[model samples]
Target: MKHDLSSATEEQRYIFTDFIKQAQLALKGDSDYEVFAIQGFAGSGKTWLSALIIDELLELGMKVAVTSPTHKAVRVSLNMLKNNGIDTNSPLMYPGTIHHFLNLKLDHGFAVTTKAKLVVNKFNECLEYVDVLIVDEASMVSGELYDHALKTLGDRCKIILFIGDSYQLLPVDDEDSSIFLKDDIFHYKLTKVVRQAEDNIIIAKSQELIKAMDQKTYYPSVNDYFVNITEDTEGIKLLKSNVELFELYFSDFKDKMTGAYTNKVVNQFNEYIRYTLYQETKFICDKDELVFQETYTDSKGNIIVSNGEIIEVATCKLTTDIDKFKIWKIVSKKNELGECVRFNVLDPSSYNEFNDLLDKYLADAKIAKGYDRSKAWKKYFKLKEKYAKVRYNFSSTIHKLQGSTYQNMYFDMRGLDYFYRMNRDNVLRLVYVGITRASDQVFILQD
Candidate 1:
């Protein structure tokens, strides 16, 4: 029987069916008072399950509110669902970050002068209308946030569904924040993988390493091998070579390396390797004429723009580029004495000019007052609603990359050393996060 499973292959169909059975069990009765946790490896159909659950809940005439701890995860899931033909504008589809959905204020109740209280109150009001709340990337959520979620939902009978991969990267305070309670929560695991076999192997090896170190129940198939490379030329060379080999085997790999010298040699090296692979196969670099531009809006809604940029090969592009040709200059008001830094097109002359402009801009207190304001400060003054056009660098960490399918990725594993010392468990978690970002292929390099 040729069933309409969209474009899902045979393997995907089997997995989807299994997910449906689990959904049935969870959604069997009215007034369900249970939390269903579905864990899976990166690219192992976790998001697909979430989508399926959303569809099922909607069909059951239940209003669904989807959220994640981080804005990035929320954006990614919302984008994915939209791409999958889900109507994002539908009233039934309420997708946003947990903070936004829960109405959490940075200052809590004390900052009544801030809009945080109002936002939180509004969120509480919104939750009253929802019958179900679905939290994607649940592993990243802390207990405090989870409690807040429950309280905000208001509806005591509302069903809560948490979908995430146990092995994937988690929140900074994940240990304290995770709400993986055994009771009242039906735990489900997705063992079968449909993404990169090499990534799956790495995830498995990483799990084995974890089990050997601690007596923990590890998911071997979802964990990958973890390798720590010293910050040296030899380590860099080896990392580059290994990435190339992986790219060869994985046709979906997109090169992220570049051939540029900078103080941040590690970041540059990784990007160079990625770019090389991209040049050979995907040819995304061939768009030489594509200009990168960075723009910012002032308090008066005046647009200040900068252009004429080139990809800089660095250990980490200090000027983080979100897309092709768009790079952001990280500026701090306290550090810069409340000034707007000018964009530099790689000239010392331009750099000096930017500093001057920043100083001048800071001197103008009218514009500078709102410009240098922190997130909390801005919310306090209702500045977000007043000046909603403000934009910042689209910075991303490994944890945010989970459940997201990308065409290509460049993994800068040089940070592995730092993570290994602080959180060894996340070494593989980071790798899994990076590798799964790519749908076609991934290039991972370290220094």
Candidate 2:
């Protein structure tokens, strides 16, 4: 439990030491309401800072419960601690969200209710009396939850720590639900971003945005990374040509190129790069992999082709060359006969013929009679107007780019029509989210 916090900046170290001292005083029955809300912006190492504090507390023989609003966040926290070679499985370490541990439901507004107190009492017994509750994603927590937590643990517990970023997102009833609005709590915001390498310029620009430090320094200059070029081509072709022009620069940043507020644009941009980079190199009869394919809706409203997915049999041939594999599978189905009385058996003349037969396989709506629509399919119009989906992937929307960090990026800042339709507040949020996606290098296309 040797917490090496030398990597932390002076301000961070000071905050940590003060936090521990306050908690120790509470443990010795000297202080009350020992709450600390430690805030840090994106890539500020808030998670790492929290983990180090957890290590010191455990070493000092205190029972600590670690939690976050999302399962991914909590698991990520545990992984960070593990990477630092910290022990996360000891009796003192309890990993869970408020819901799982205190039986406090997020929707119910975590207040100081009888149920919350009872849950706390039972939780205390279950963990042999948890001395501290370390909450991650403290910004997402409503004032209600913190209030609920304080009432339950105020006298009995030594410390309650909130590790999160207020700049990222706030609670719904923020006017009334500001968790840190109260003055009694010991609060501090980490100014330096330890997660970003010293030379990373994107973090610098975003930090300026986050703190309103310069307020004037907004977007990164494209000229700093890649010189912007103009072409004679017109309309969509020009757009296509420009994409290719930048594609050359992004050879090293293949999957990392991401941006766009809309799923359609993301899908199209992702498809464009994939097609331009790796042309048709298709094969069949091999991996037995389930894939998303082109699709349609029938008279019964059943989806046909289901993202144009094709199941490759184990005997099917395989190849890495087949990059742009989608946009296939559709045929006329005779409704009354309930029949696609065509293409039978696995024997195929060639790959092209197999594809033709697949057309039949996909359009058989008689096959979808009672099919469970609940089955998970690949990124169908799963866009949900916004991805609250897994954030930060190969081609991610601002909604899904929240917790991600990338080395280099080719951004699609020129968003779709749907994006401009949003309110100013949401639009600002989208911009803020998109700007922080790049870690070091950046290339941009402005709207």
Candidate 3:
């Protein structure tokens, strides 16, 4: 599938063709710049440009592999490609996380590289088919991982493109390692916001924020799209008032999202929204929206679910008559291909940790054979209450909101003072990212 050039602005069109020319020159061994870094701010159409570049590269008979720093980032690129009329389901267009691309294992929130011969052999096999590797959200990719990717694939891949907003948050734990500043990387900065976003208040405010950050200035104005609740005494009342209209305007959780700096604020806001929506505060409910607490991998070490992924619960049941069983059936959501996917919570046969936890609880309760089924069931539920992996998704930390967008955004700016106390430089980037996630309007909650 080819991308429509008319969909892009003239500047984008020019850059797209120039990128293809450079990539071709590099492919023919006539150029020294095999790596390119394209930087763009929010609403600048970076993903849209990438889709066009990919279409041209595919037409030029190149085998491209698209990846990102995380699964959510890859999904973002995939979703954008789908919007651009690209067949992402095709084998040549399959996207993956950089960790999986580099055969890195994620254990306890750390990425561990494999050195086994079999892993090396499999990586070598990838070299045979992959000619170009495009990494989205390159800003979050650590310099170490970028070098690893280059060293592993440079010998075979003709072109490597890194695309992201440098103004956004830096890589976790390594703020100093900027990949875009490397000596050999060609830089392309996209400055024009897409025409479609020209009138969007969220994008307009984001641009203003970017200008303020660049100029080291401040703007304390508010409008219909930007509200200030910094000194409000009735913030809860205001939020409840909005939630009534919010619920009416949006039918599902995906239509809008709330973002904040800290997990505490995120949790508090989520609970607040939950109470407003369902009038309950239980950990697990018959019907509730949830975000995965962490990345979930399968037995083969394949990531089946990414952290910050949103899911909804359709029903939850606990049966103590025959066997102590607890089940949660998630509401079905559509996949990239428009196929429905449903997830069931804690399958005992496959989840060893859950099994071990239940065993520990059973042992601690001294529940031997033929113990009271009702009491054992009570303990089982108690264990679940203590270690549930899902939580309310009405709001999430801004970091988790990366590579995501919503029609409406409820951003909590109440953490600005805390962030200023901790890291002053991060406030601008945090607010920039938070505001840009919304396409319609941003309801700033400073309370």
Candidate 4:
């Protein structure tokens, strides 16, 4: 079955129609879709448009694999299809990560070298006599990964469509410009947004694109929606949103992410930005369930032990060389299980020597019970790290946040304070990835 570009949306622009039509031609041919690209801005309705194209091809009774480089993009595609009342459960309507499509074991650090990619791909059964392949977040795909996906698919596959905004985050650690960076492939450029007349996102989202491509900038005469924050406090508000509206805190608070050049400054930023000291109140056995030997400070200067203290007990330290489970004195005690045991929040240091022994013990237990020790060792260390708790989100390098998107994010611009003059890779790209994570909002804290 051949895709029909003429059967397109009434609202679609000419460029979009041409792209889908071109895609149709490619799919109804001997080679996979090449030089196929759709460059649309965020909220410019790329997924919405892709949903239409997806249905069009599916109607032709063709197997369609809708995939992205990341989980978030896959979800975005799923939600768009769902909202449009499209069926997703069909084996024909497969949507997942490129890794899933290619049968890549990424967590084990899978590579895509020749025979490295398995011939027994999970999508193989679906790939035979395929109709279409869609790669979302094309801008985030590294040149190698993009070519590798195509190389892996071979010319036997049908049409392939690469959809994404070059303005969004790029592939981390790849250093090279994405395949989208090239001008010849851009089939359509989405330039209209209905969210507002002048949105901060409308302004900030174009920063990197403007800096890099200077392709076009949309500045409306209508007023701006929000102001930028220089100090962290400007963007913060008390917990006010319901749980459904936000996964963690109030909408404005949870998405508050910050970046710094050094890990030290990042820690400081996390202490204050990711919310200086809060982890969504937990079930503490209260003061009566608490005991401490004395006040002590880590070389890092944060207190580890003290009176009226509450410590998270990760290890029972029982019967082993460490303690009798009650080996140490309850040098001090409180009578209630309330907020009395609140400060010096303690847990085993992740890289500590004691944890090494604990890991070995847990691994030995696994191997003793017929499990793989080599793999079980990593499992025990991870399980012992925390008891399923959501502490602070964590301070990460700009690289860490590359593939991530947030509801609302904060950027500590102090990392670029003095080095702005060096003219290296340029902080523009860093700030772009950091800022675009917020689908709706972003705050920049300089001080």
Candidate 5:
């Protein structure tokens, strides 16, 4: 383990070193509580601090595990740890999503329900003896998920630490159930911006926005990074004109997600970008471009396909029997070698006996009431339907954009009906989350 804190700011260094001291005491059963929370705004060196803490914990010969609410965040956490001199390949470093760690099946539906009870799995087994469990993106963690995680862990984990910005949007359904909102947890808020982010204009602008939110004041100014566009059309034009940067929009609403949004403006904006600027058309058998509607992770919890990523279909296979399914092999756009990643199978017929067969099989086994078998069958059918659930990569909701970092972002900052309906604090938080997603620059839309 390589632990270095020389590059950290004084405030960050103090917090990191003190956390190590507290962690050591907790190991010796001298601490009051087992859970610790580190709250910070964007650019406060949370990721760097996390890496330092993990490296130090491993140096103490403690079994450390890292997880995040989303796969993108887990990937980001692992990469940051690796970049900060931690040997991510080492056996001591366990990195994955909280859902994967708990061995729970995520529904990804409107209802936030798990398919089955968390059984003993390799991920949870690690928690059985893990000396420290680090959960990143704490703000994104729903209270329900956190409660499930705690119940699954029981009395096994020795020390638990959560790190994230509390100023972000709350979890999807349980908007009031964010883990960071708990008052009992030991909390440390990092206030100083790190040296690396101090010079970035976006970070500074984000800080200013946070201040505006704190004071309950309207921030009616725009700079170079936070330039205002006249309308959604102007924002689209800006994105179309920019040729150098990786363009993206952080929308307040998921216009096309799961067939709903806070308003229709989001859907309208995304549609224009996909249909007009990008000149994209409907899904062609083997020709049109498509984006992954959901993230796909391997059994080991490594993200195989990221959400909102572009995919190309290579070939299509029609099943001989209607009971089976039609299969499409899509190109892994991110894979450098250019190979088909997986078989996306879809059952063509809406009325099929396969589901009935599956139900009868589960009933005969006397586990029909159990979620494992039924959910698995339903997930397979859902997978078949989800295989065709592809959209063009353009704008995404602020909720989906959490824990995502991009080179450049064109944010939809203009006031909308959703903002008018939302709480002022939450609206500011959502805008803050959108603004911080861009590390390079953010072009805000006005009017």
Candidate 6:
């Protein structure tokens, strides 16, 4: 089958071709150090490069196992590979988020022997069945996590490829042990920018900003809209007013926008300013009316409530089901009562141990909803003390947005400047991470 370079621009095509050559050379045979890292900025065609490499490896009859740090990221690559004609369900392609792939149980006290065995079995299966392993988004992965990941793969020497832009933000771990910056790896950095700013003014300003920062910045001469929001009342207000603009522009992309707020004040600002626009403009109209009709069966095998309404329980509930249900017509709303509720038409006596299981699921689900890991994890540690139990929320973070596309986004960076400016590549990485959510249009509201 012919690889489709039709959707990619000429520049992207050229870059991809170059990366393929490097990949082929790396895979010709296994070296003492059989790890390769390909780093590029956001929208720099990392997915395209990975696809090309995977295709070449597959042609060589090499067994390939691919995974990302998150399920959403895995889905993004899976979709991209599928679009390029790779079968997602192929036995050779072990595509999944690291946690899912590793069968990790993040709970501190949970005995993970069974989970570990499952993960080891999968890894051994991949190694026995495959000759190569490719990991995308290496920048966001921690060394410790990578070590854990390696445990599953066993001691087998497999041709491994790591692709990511080192400038991209790191994971939520407190340690600085990232695989990208670590030693004992062949690194390739793509210098040229494929996605440039079109508008002269915007390009000029972007260039100036890059110069001011004294780093290599590529602003394409395309009119890609970018707005920067600061942490302040004015910034929040500005974000609220322009939420509609983002929604209008990026409508064809994924239509959901989510964020993490530091305090009740910021949360209120997020709800009033951003979510309010989502409500007023009907951006979440479909999501709002989406009602899950969960059926319940009693011990007597009688159907209690047929297709009962499953309320939008919490953000985590939405995240958990978003992939399974592809919740296109559901809007998440916090119930007025502090006590959380899952809309169930059926009574609690449906399934065996239904109440107990339901309570456990709901508790964990609520905890997951407390934090958005995408872009928020960067600044999460800062607010760790202020907010208790700020777990990761895949629905709100850019990592989780990998497989999903959005129409537009209304973002408020307000006091999060420290998070964005922590590294030279961090800001644009975050911006790219966020803007890519929308395929059509994006309006950033910044202070």
Clash count for each candidate, listed in order shown: 33, 13, 0, 7, 0, 28
How would you order the candidates by TM-score, starting with the best? Answer: 3, 5, 4, 2, 6, 1
Candidate 5 per-residue lDDT, tens place, 1-447, comes to 245567667777887877888778777888666678888888888877887788888878887778776444666677787787788877776777676565564332422123322233433443434667788877656665577666633255676788888786765567777666677678878888877778776677678778877788764332222443323432122333322222333232322221112435455555765565446443334553555565554433334554444566665444433445444445543333234565353443533655565556445545445666555555444433344345544566676666777755666555533453556666667767776776655555444
Instruction: Write candidate 4's Cα lDDT for 1-447 as tens digits.
Output: 343445433345565556556656665564333656776654455666777777766666667788765444566668778787678776677776665565442121132121111233333454433557777766546554566566644453555678876555443356465666665444556666524323554344444334444533322210111123322332222222223223342334454555555556665654553342444223222222232222333322223232112244332221222231112221223212122222322332422654565667675746654345445544454334322221233455565464455666655555363554452234554555566556655555442
The TM-score values for the models, in the order shown, are 0.53, 0.56, 0.70, 0.56, 0.69, 0.55
Name the runs in model 3 displaced over 4 angstroms: 1-11, 68-76, 89-91, 107-128, 219-254, 275-290, 297-304, 311-390, 421-424
| Model 1 weakest lDDT span, ten residues long | 386-395
Provide the lowest-lDDT 10-residue window in model 4: 218-227
- Superior by lDDT: candidate 2 or candidate 5: 5
Please tell me which model should have the higher lDDT, number 4 or number 6.
4
Model 6's lDDT to the true fold? 0.45
Ranked by TM-score, the better of candidates 4 and 5 is 5
Model 3 alpha-carbon miss at residue 262, Å: 1.3
lDDT per model, in order? 0.47, 0.51, 0.64, 0.48, 0.59, 0.45
lDDT string for model 1 (179-251, tens) is 5544666666665655444354334433445454445433342222433322242212234565564554345
lDDT for model 3, please.
0.64
Candidate 2 Cα errors over 4 Å, as ranges: 1-7, 43-45, 105-129, 143-148, 155-157, 171-184, 193-196, 211-257, 262-400, 406-410, 415-430
Those runs of model 4 whose alpha carbons end farther than 4 Å from true positions after fitting are 1-12, 30-35, 106-129, 153-156, 168-173, 182-187, 191-405, 439-441
lDDT of 2: 0.51
Put down candidate 3 lDDT per residue, 1-447, tens digits, no spaces.
Answer: 255678777778887888888878776777657778888888898878888888777778777888875544666777778787777776655477666566653332111112111122232344334778888767656665676677754574777888888787764667777766677788888888887778765677677668767776653322222343222522111243445435643564547887778878788777777877788644467677667775544433344554555655555543221244454545445544343444445433435766787788767556534546445545554454332366677788787677777877777676476555465447777888887777755556553
